[PDB]
Design a protein around this ligand. Structure first.
Ligand SMILES: O=c1ccn([C@@H]2O[C@H](COP(=O)(O)OP(=O)(O)O)[C@@H](O)[C@H]2O)c(=O)[nH]1
Length: 443
C-alpha cells in the first residue's frame, strides 16, 4: 500500500486541479493525504476518503503572514512568504507523517503545485521524490522559456499587431499583456521553473491533442518525465468549491431551449471598473441572447457586488448569480457558449464539455490561452481590444447564432470528442495516466 501527499496552493484555480488529481490517484489505489493551509481550506467533510493536515498558518499565526487580507490581490502574498519561510515546518510535517507510517505503508511521493518551489529542497532532504502539478498550459510554459528571446526584442520593456519573431502563434501585444509585470513576478517565475525542471516528474492538466505543438518543448526543456491528464474529463471540481453553489440555476436552465444560453464568468479573482462592468452588461443585453452571468462579490470596483445595475435591467433573458458549479453548468444542454476570462481551468472545462468560447483576459497566462484557443484550435472568438458594447454583441452572436460561426461550434464539438477519445484505451491521456501510476509505484 502506498500513500501520496499533495500540497496545493490555497486558491480556487489551484485547489481544484490538485484535488481532481488526488481523486484520480485514489481511484488507482493510492491513499491520499492533503497538506493545506487553514486559509482558503476546502470543505474537508466533502473528502471522507482523504486525510487533511493543516500546516503553515496554524495559530499562533506568524507575524509575516498574520494580518494578511483573506481576499483581493494582496491575499497572494502568502505564496512568496511561504516559499521563503515555510521549509522548516514542511520538513517537520513530512517527517512526522513518514514516521507514523504503517509498517505495510510507504509514502511514495509528494505532489505540489509548481508554485511551491521551496518544496523541492525539502523533499530532497528527506529522500522523498517530488512531482509537480502545473495548473497552466504547455503553451504558456513554452512562452515562459522563450522570454530571453522576448527580452532581447524589448517585448518585455514597454508594433503590437505583428506576430512575434520567436512565436508565430502569438502577437507582440499578447506578450506585452502576459508579461506586463516582469520586475515583480520574474523572481518567483524563475525559481518555479528551476525547481520544476529539477523535480522527479511533471503532471500537466491538458491532453496531447489539445497542445500537440508544445510537446517537444516540454520534452526538451524538462528532463523529468511529463504526463498530460485532462482532469475535468475525469471529474468535476464541484467538491473543492470554496463558495456555496447557487443550484437554483439548473431549474432556470431547464426552461431554456438547447444551446440558447451564454454562460459568463471571469473567474475567481478578476476585478473590473464600475465603468467596464456596465459596458459588458449593455453588451450582453445588446446581443439579445439569454445569459447566465456569474459576478463574484467584489468583481466590481466601488461596489460590494452589483449595485450599479438598475433593478430589472437584465430583464427577461438574463440572470446574475454569485457562484455555480461551473463545469456542471457548462455540461447543461441549454449552454451555447461561454464568455470566459481564459483562466486555464475554465478554458479546459469548456473544451472538455464542447462549449465554444468568447475570450477576454486579465493578463498573466490568460491572453496566451485566448490566443491559442482562438487562432490555433479555433474554438472561440477573442475580444482582444477592451470592452465595447458593440463588439461584444457581434462576437456573442457569431459564436451562438451566426451561420458564419458554425465552424467554431463544430470545432468545439470535435475537440471535446478528442478529449473523450484520449481517455479511451490506447488514447494519449489513458497511456499517460497508466505511465504516471506505474512510475509513482516504482518510486
Ligand atoms: O461560478 C464559478 C466560477 C468558477 N468556478 C471554478 O473556479 C475555477 C476557476 O479557475 P480558472 O483557472 O478558470 O481561473 P481563476 O479564477 O483562477 O482566475 C474553475 O475550476 C471554475 O470551474 C466555479 O466552480 N464556479
Amino acid at each position: 500500500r502506498r500513500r501520496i501527499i499533495l500540497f496545493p496552493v490555497p486558491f480556487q484555480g489551484h485547489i481544484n486541479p490538485i484535488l481532481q488529481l488526488a481523486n484520480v490517484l485514489y481511484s488507482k489505489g493510492f491513499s491520499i493525504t492533503i497538506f493545506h493551509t487553514n486559509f482558503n481550506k476546502p470543505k474537508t467533510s466533502n473528502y471522507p476518503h482523504f486525510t487533511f493536515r493543516f500546516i503553515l498558518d496554524n495559530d499562533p499565526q506568524d507575524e509575516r503572514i498574520s494580518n494578511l487580507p483573506t481576499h483581493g490581490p494582496l491575499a497572494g502574498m502568502r505564496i512568496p512568504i511561504i516559499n521563503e519561510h515555510g521549509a522548516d515546518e514542511l520538513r517537520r510535517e513530512l517527517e512526522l507523517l513518514m514516521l507514523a507510517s504503517e509498517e505495510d505503508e510507504e509514502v511514495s511521493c509528494l505532489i505540489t503545485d509548481a508554485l511551491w518551489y521551496f518544496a523541492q529542497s525539502v523533499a530532497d532532504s528527506l529522500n522523498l521524490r517530488r512531482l509537480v502539478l502545473m495548473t497552466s498550459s504547455l503553451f504558456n510554459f513554452h512562452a515562459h522559456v522563450s522570454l530571453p528571446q522576448f527580452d532581447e526584442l524589448g517585448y518585455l520593456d514597454p508594433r503590437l499587431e505583428e506576430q512575434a519573431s520567436g512565436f508565430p502563434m502569438l502577437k507582440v501585444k499578447d506578450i506585452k499583456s502576459a508579461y506586463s509585470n516582469w520586475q515583480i513576478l520574474k523572481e518567483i517565475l524563475g525559481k518555479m521553473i528551476k525547481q520544476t525542471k529539477a523535480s522527479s516528474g511533471v503532471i500537466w492538466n491538458s491532453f496531447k491533442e489539445l497542445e500537440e505543438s508544445e510537446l517537444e518543448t516540454v520534452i526538451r526543456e524538462i528532463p523529468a518525465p511529463s504526463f498530460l491528464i485532462p482532469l475535468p474529463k475525469h471529474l468535476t471540481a464541484s467538491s473543492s468549491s470554496l463558495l456555496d453553489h447557487d443550484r437554483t440555476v439548473f431549474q432556470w436552465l431547464d426552461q431554456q431551449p438547447p444551446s440558447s444560453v451564454l454562460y459568463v464568468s471571469f473567474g475567481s479573482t478578476s476585478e473590473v471598473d464600475e465603468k467596464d462592468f456596465l459596458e459588458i452588461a449593455r453588451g450582453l443585453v445588446d446581443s439579445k441572447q439569454s445569459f447566465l452571468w456569474v459576478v463574484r462579490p467584489g468583481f466590481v470596483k466601488g461596489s460590494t457586488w452589483v449595485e450599479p445595475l438598475p433593478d430589472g435591467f437584465l430583464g427577461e433573458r438574463g440572470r446574475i448569480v454569485k457562484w455555480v458549479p461551473q463545469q456542471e453548468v457548462l455540461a447543461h444542454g441549454a449552454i451555447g457558449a461561454f464568455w470566459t476570462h481564459s483562466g486555464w481551468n475554465s478554458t479546459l472545462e469548456s473544451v472538455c464539455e464542447g462549449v465554444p468560447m468568447i475570450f477576454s483576459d486579465f493578463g498573466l497566462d490568460q491572453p496566451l490561452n485566448a490566443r491559442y484557443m482562438s487562432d490555433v484550435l479555433k474554438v472561440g472568438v477573442y475580444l482582444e481590444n477592451g470592452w465595447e458594447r458593440g463588439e461584444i454583441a457581434n462576437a456573442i452572436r457569431r459564436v451562438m447564432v451566426d451561420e458564419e460561426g458554425e465552424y467554431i461550434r463544430q470545432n468545439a464539438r470535435v475537440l471535446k470528442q478528442k478529449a473523450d477519445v484520449s481517455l479511451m484505451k490506447g488514447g494519449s491521456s489513458y497511456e499517460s495516466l497508466e505511465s504516471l501510476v506505474s512510475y509513482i509505484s516504482s518510486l
